[PDB]
């Protein structure tokens, strides 16, 4: 196929950049708060017995 | 009766210090269990550590 109408390639980029652009996000806020587990929502079992304890 | 106050105090101290060793809820040297296990491998194999009470 040779559309003028629509391209999946840029579609694939656009999806590895937005899965890299969200390993970032995580990198960057495990980077700004200096912990792995620093919110509920990374993982509840750890945080919240880290909470209690 | 000083040196016998002396003791009871001394071990009072040591069932505290026994009773008060505890992490996340359970505890490998106040004797509540017999063992602890944590994983060791993805498969689900464990780590075993016995408990030995003090």
Redesign the interface.
Known sequence: LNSINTNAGAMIALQNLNGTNSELTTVQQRINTGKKIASAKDNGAIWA?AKN? | NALKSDFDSLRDQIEKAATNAK??GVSIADGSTTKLTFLANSDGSGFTVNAKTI
């Open positions: 017995t304890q | 992490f996340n």
